[PDB]
Design a protein around this ligand. Structure first.
Ligand SMILES: *[C@@H]1O[C@H](CO)[C@@H](O[C@@H]2O[C@H](CO)[C@@H](O[C@H]3O[C@H](CO)[C@@H](O)[C@H](O)[C@@H]3O)[C@H](O)[C@H]2NC(C)=O)[C@H](O)[C@H]1NC(C)=O
Ligand SMILES: *[C@@H]1O[C@H](CO)[C@@H](O[C@@H]2O[C@H](CO)[C@@H](O[C@H]3O[C@H](CO)[C@@H](O)[C@H](O)[C@@H]3O)[C@H](O)[C@H]2NC(C)=O)[C@H](O)[C@H]1NC(C)=O
Ligand SMILES: *[C@@H]1O[C@H](CO)[C@@H](O[C@@H]2O[C@H](CO)[C@@H](O)[C@H](O)[C@H]2NC(C)=O)[C@H](O)[C@H]1NC(C)=O
Ligand SMILES: *[C@@H]1O[C@H](CO)[C@@H](O)[C@H](O)[C@H]1NC(C)=O
Ligand SMILES: *[C@@H]1O[C@H](CO)[C@@H](O)[C@H](O)[C@H]1NC(C)=O
Ligand SMILES: *[C@@H]1O[C@H](CO)[C@@H](O)[C@H](O)[C@H]1NC(C)=O
Ligand SMILES: *[C@@H]1O[C@H](CO)[C@@H](O)[C@H](O)[C@H]1NC(C)=O
Ligand SMILES: *[C@@H]1O[C@H](CO)[C@@H](O)[C@H](O)[C@H]1NC(C)=O
Ligand SMILES: *[C@@H]1O[C@H](CO)[C@@H](O)[C@H](O)[C@H]1NC(C)=O
Ligand SMILES: *[C@@H]1O[C@H](CO)[C@@H](O)[C@H](O)[C@H]1NC(C)=O
Ligand SMILES: *[C@@H]1O[C@H](CO)[C@@H](O)[C@H](O)[C@H]1NC(C)=O
Length: 898
């Protein structure tokens, strides 16, 4: 029935093209104003997760816990121009070798670099900002020393303390070797056992553990460390931009300072937590010219290869109609308020250009092959061609729009934002193609009929060769061979289906030969500990009874399966349960603080005030009596009576490290009638983690210790849990269920494609099943290609897969319709008619995107662009072409109905 409205509409547009072009331009500039209005695009690193996800919400809770995770400005450092040197102690019999950067002079130089960074000045708001302004100092205003995890903090970042040398002027009883080999064994002691009782604490960033500062060593022999680590953590507020961009300005200042540091005895490696965003922005800028020149080639082909009489202005007009559809959909979607990811900016114009050029060429070459008959007015020729061809363009474009508009049902944000734009852009494309471009075609027909230079204003060469191609490869000679080869290759891709990869390799996602590739190679080469993991026991636990404490605490007196104990046992088998070390426990150190034996806690005679551990007043008595009931862990109120005193005491040589030092932010204290210990974390670290697989494993198993511990706890219903949080849990959680999301997405596509292209084709089941079955072949073979060229299954590749099928509809759909409706007496005859009539046009929506999908590789060296976008575009152009224009005519010659 569509042929009546299509025909009288073609005659209407041919009649009065002014109304058509004018109105359609009111539409075009109407929607395209939202492009200039909102224009908002999203680039925050939240692009790889949907809100209200598991890891996303857990990130919220940890963002009330200790707030945001700090930004890490790190330096992996080493000395190439020094050798080992051996320490022979006096006089006890043993020997300890010392690695290359363990030489004292190299340590001195590293301290010079460290002090050079310690006062680095950046200017924000025409003001002054140092590292002291942005670093996180735990203690304030007492001891605002910046947290710096370097080995030199064993000597308090001071040369005069590094050059202690107990011993007469011949023998050495204790030098830096000794203090080092004692601190890396008890790095929270304030008194060395021998050397003038030097402290192993630091300019307090904290008790410096040797995994955060030493690398390349072996097996608890820290004395052979081949590369030191200097970690400046800096506060990283998420809900504030003044302080954030302050820290970022200082970070690029740091990056430039390290890029320009002359020291022939050192080989550095560095990273500020703004390095990856800045280096990705830098990365996707070298190949923009190459994309533009690709589009230049494609537009040129569209201008010349249509049909000094040719269709140049026509091709330019169709190009502008496609771009008007793109900017129209972008305009309306920005109007309503929609972020516009870069993936969309890359995938959308290629798609809308392929579909638009396909419909354009179908219509134009549909008129060119057509011969009028006697009294044919332009209404009754171009309305006839429009009624003859428009059902195919409408079938394809409509199935595509309904399969892309339906792709945005999933939760993955990239494919969401993409598929919306895809749907509306293809629909507006078809509308500006059936309304405006028809009245644009009749006018070039008039121009060519009046004989005025078509640049200044039978069946050509290829219809011949298609007519020669069909019978040779459609005879019963070839007819089985095609099913043989395509079913065989299909089975091959089914074989390498389960053996395909997942994730983004860190070093390849960077412009090779940046300052970041060296960092990744040298953290795989040296470092011994990954990003910290915080084990959050949510608010609501007791913490104030022997039962409640035995559920949580570790070591002596507490249960076998408590939180700390389970984290520690999992730290034993660190190469499986990705968790590296024992957990920094707040309650375990609190119990070793209020000890009546260790004089760390003393309260006044009546005033009940905490007594500074260095005080001297005979009125502070025991916080807990040494009565056998007293010399015990504080159950009940006494707990809350002394916990805030612990979370205030700063390090004292007559006591420990104090609670303010490390656990002041690790323990939330809610003053609600009258004191409680809600929402506390236990911190440890995360082994290696040098590939996407490693990250996924760490996520799985850390959450496994989570649910596992929460099981061993007496949970009243499900109130609170014990979840783990690291920096990366939000980004590598898509891969936790990408396959279920792939299967679904593509699946829904092949459903929509199946529904429309079956009801649109006269409720004919077999035409659909054959067509979208061939498209399923396209996608499975596409996964085989993914295996062969080694591309991954992330959000980008999945988006390009959905779009890949949506573009395969443009190959198989037109042929399927052209065969389904025809009155030839044979299956083979209708196959030749369909393939010759439509295949000659479809192979002009192919050659342009191939000749662009060649220059795409030509000048673009970005590994992500060359491996993902180029090889996939190529894969779906060649794969789709060969599956719609080679196999499908054979499968239809076999099972195509009559
Ligand atoms: C990394 O450091 C390890 C520190 O323990 C070290 O083991 C130690 O190796 C030295 C080698 O000089 C042994 O010193 C030995 O020197 C005399 C020289 O004749 C030998 O006869 C003896 O074996 C003597 O022990 C240390 O004794 C040894 N330390 C211990 C506790 O056994 C590793 O060899 C170092 N490895 C690397 C790759 O650097
Ligand atoms: C998990 O893997 C770790 C490395 O991936 C591994 O450390 C490596 O293994 C041991 C240290 O335990 C050292 O191998 C050493 O074995 C004996 C002592 O048991 C000594 O003769 C030598 O020190 C020998 O080299 C490796 O040097 C060490 N590698 C590095 C880079 O430090 C862990 O031990 C593994 N943990 C478990 C629980 O298996
Ligand atoms: C925080 O660090 C500074 C230096 O970074 C410490 O200053 C040192 O003070 C003691 C004197 O009592 C000596 O080690 C040196 O005179 C200083 N060292 C340097 C490098 O200047 C300061 O004491 C630290 N603050 C606390 C509370 O420990
Ligand atoms: C920064 O401070 C250090 C001492 O902490 C000093 O040696 C250096 O000259 C200072 N640099 C600038 C630019 O102020
Ligand atoms: C900052 O302000 C001062 C005077 O207020 C001016 O002299 C200086 O040029 C400003 N800084 C920059 C970078 O323009
Ligand atoms: C601990 O170190 C200090 C140095 O400040 C020293 O005075 C004190 O005697 C040391 N303690 C012991 C028990 O040696
Ligand atoms: C390290 O380099 C400095 C200057 O670059 C030089 O004075 C010193 O001698 C060097 N030390 C070694 C061990 O090469
Ligand atoms: C803790 O001890 C019990 C015996 O009381 C034992 O059965 C259980 O396996 C232990 N837990 C772990 C994690 O080994
Ligand atoms: C502290 O108070 C008690 C009250 O029983 C008193 O006996 C004691 O003398 C007081 N402390 C001093 C140093 O006087
Ligand atoms: C006790 O400690 C605080 C800070 O730790 C310090 O300011 C105070 O002076 C100390 N007590 C005395 C009596 O000095
Ligand atoms: C959790 O794993 C531990 C092994 O460490 C075991 O004691 C406990 O039974 C597990 N929880 C459940 C619900 O199986």
């Amino acid at each position: 029935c569509l042929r009546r409205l299509f025909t009288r509409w073609g005659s209407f547009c041919v009649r009065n093209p002014g109304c058509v072009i004018f109105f359609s331009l009111v539409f075009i500039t109407a929607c395209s104003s939202g492009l200039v209005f909102v224009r908002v695009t999203t680039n925050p690193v939240d692009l790889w997760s949907a809100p209200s996800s598991q890891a996303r919400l857990e990130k919220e809770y940890f963002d009330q816990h200790f707030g945001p995770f700090f930004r890490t400005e790190q330096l992996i450092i080493r000395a190439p121009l020094t050798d080992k040197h051996i320490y022979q102690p006096y006089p006890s019999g043993a020997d300890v070798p010392f690695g290359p950067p363990l030489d004292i002079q190299i340590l001195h130089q590293v301290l010079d670099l460290q002090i050079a960074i310690e006062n680095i000045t950046a200017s924000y708001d025409n003001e002054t900002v140092t590292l002291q302004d942005i670093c996180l100092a735990p203690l304030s205003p007492y001891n605002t020393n910046c947290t710096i995890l370097s080995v030199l903090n064993y000597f308090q970042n001071s040369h005069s303390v590094l050059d202690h040398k107990k011993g007469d002027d011949f023998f050495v009883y204790a030098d830096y070797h000794t203090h080092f080999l004692y601190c890396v064994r008890a790095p929270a002691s304030l008194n060395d056992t021998s050397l003038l009782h030097d402290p192993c604490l630091g300019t307090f960033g904290g008790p410096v553990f040797p995994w955060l500062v030493l690398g390349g060593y072996d097996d608890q022999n820290y004395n052979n460390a081949t590369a030191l680590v200097i970690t400046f953590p800096v506060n990283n507020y998420y809900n504030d931009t003044e302080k954030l961009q302050r820290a970022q300005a200082w970070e690029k200042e740091f990056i430039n300072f390290v890029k320009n540091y002359k020291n022939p005895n050192l080989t550095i490696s560095f990273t500020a937590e703004r390095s990856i965003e800045d280096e990705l922005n830098r990365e996707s800028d070298s190949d923009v010219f190459t994309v533009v020149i690709s589009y230049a080639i494609m537009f040129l082909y569209i201008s010349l290869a249509l049909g000094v009489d040719s269709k140049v202005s026509l091709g330019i007009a169709g190009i502008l109609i496609v771009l008007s559809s793109v900017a129209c959909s972008l305009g309306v979607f920005s109007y309503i308020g929609l972020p516009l990811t870069l993936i969309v900016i890359e995938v959308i114009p290629f798609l809308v250009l392929a579909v638009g050029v396909d419909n354009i060429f179908i219509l134009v070459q549909a008129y060119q092959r057509d011969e009028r008959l006697q009294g044919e007015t332009l209404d009754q020729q171009l309305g006839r061609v429009l009624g003859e061809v428009a059902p195919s363009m409408f079938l394809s474009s409509f199935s595509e729009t309904v399969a892309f508009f339906l792709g945005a049902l999933s939760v993955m944000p990239a494919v969401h934002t993409f598929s919306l734009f895809a749907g509306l852009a293809v629909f507006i494309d078809f509308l500006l193609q059936i309304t405006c471009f028809v009245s644009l075609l009749g006018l070039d027909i008039k121009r060519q009929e009046k004989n005025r230079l078509d640049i200044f204003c039978e069946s050509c060469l290829f219809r011949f060769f298609k007519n020669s191609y069909s019978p040779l490869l459609l005879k019963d000679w070839m007819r089985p061979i095609v099913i043989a080869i395509f079913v065989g290759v299909l089975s091959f891709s089914i074989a390498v289906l389960n053996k395909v990869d997942i994730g983004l390799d860190q070093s390849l996602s960077m412009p090779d030969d940046s300052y970041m590739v060296d960092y990744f190679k040298s953290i795989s080469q040296y470092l011994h500990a990954g990003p910290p993991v915080y084990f959050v026991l949510e608010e609501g636990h007791d913490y104030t009874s022997s039962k409640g404490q035995n559920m949580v605490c570790g070591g002596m007196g507490c249960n076998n399966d408590s939180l700390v104990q389970q984290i520690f046992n999992a730290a034993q088998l660190d190469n499986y349960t990705r968790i590296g070390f024992a957990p920094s426990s707040w309650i375990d150190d609190y119990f070793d603080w209020v000890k009546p034996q260790s004089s760390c806690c003393r309260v006044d005679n009546i005033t009940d005030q905490f007594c500074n551990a260095s005080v001297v007043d005979p009125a502070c008595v025991r916080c807990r009596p040494l009565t056998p009931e007293g010399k015990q862990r504080p159950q009940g109120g006494d707990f809350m009576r002394f916990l805030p005193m612990f979370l205030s005491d700063n390090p004292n040589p007559k006591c420990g490290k104090g609670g303010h030092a490390a656990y002041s932010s690790a323990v939330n204290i809610l003053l609600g009638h009258g004191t409680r210990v809600g929402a506390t974390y236990f911190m440890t670290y995360h082994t290696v983690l040098q590939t996407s697989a490693d990250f996924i494993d760490a996520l799985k198993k850390a959450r496994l210790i989570a649910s596992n511990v929460t099981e061993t706890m007496g949970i009243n219903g499900s109130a609170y849990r014990v979840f783990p949080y690291s920096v990366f849990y939000v980004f590598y959680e898509q891969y936790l269920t990408i396959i279920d999301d792939t299967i679904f997405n593509l699946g829904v596509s092949l459903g929509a494609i199946f529904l429309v292209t079956m009801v649109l084709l006269g409720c004919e089941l077999w035409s659909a099943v054959i067509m979208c079955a061939t498209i399923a072949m396209v996608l499975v073979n596409m996964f085989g290609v993914m295996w062969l060229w080694g591309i991954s299954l992330n959000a980008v590749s999945l988006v390009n897969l959905v779009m890949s099928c949506g573009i395969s509809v443009e190959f198989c759909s037109h042929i399927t319709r052209a065969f389904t409706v025809s009155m030839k007496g044979s299956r083979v005859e209708r196959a030749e008619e369909a393939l010759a009539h439509m295949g000659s046009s479809v192979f002009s929506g192919i050659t342009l995107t191939k000749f662009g999908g060649i220059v795409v590789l030509a000048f673009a060296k970005s590994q992500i662009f060359q491996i993902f976008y180029f090889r996939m575009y190529l894969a779906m152009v060649l794969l789709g072409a060969t599956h719609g224009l080679i196999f499908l005519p054979v499968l239809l010659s076999y099972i195509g109905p009559s």
